[PDB]
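We treat protein structure as text, and this decision shapes the records that our systems exchange. The remainder of this section carries one protein's record, kept here as part of the documentation:
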Amino acid sequence: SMSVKKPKRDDSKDLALCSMILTEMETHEDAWPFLLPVNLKLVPGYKKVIKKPMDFSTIREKLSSGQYPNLETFALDVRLVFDNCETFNEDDSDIGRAGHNMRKYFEKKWTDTFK
């Protein structure tokens, strides 16, 4: 509360560390469904159904331009990518499986880097 603060957790490396994680997500072999925004002209249903599209290139630009106020807003967008994927794709599809694999990969890197 006012003039009462928990000890200051060092957040000075978060930007660099989120960038490293994002690099590792970008270079994963199953990243291909997530590298670029879904083409809303070419994919029926996407625009109406997925209220907040998100992809790794969009996260990378937001990261690089100071549009994440803290590491939690970064994780929210990464998770959004996978939550969108599960909303639109069957579990038993290449993309559906890719999304599960990437979410697992992300969550481990997140826990190991920060928790």
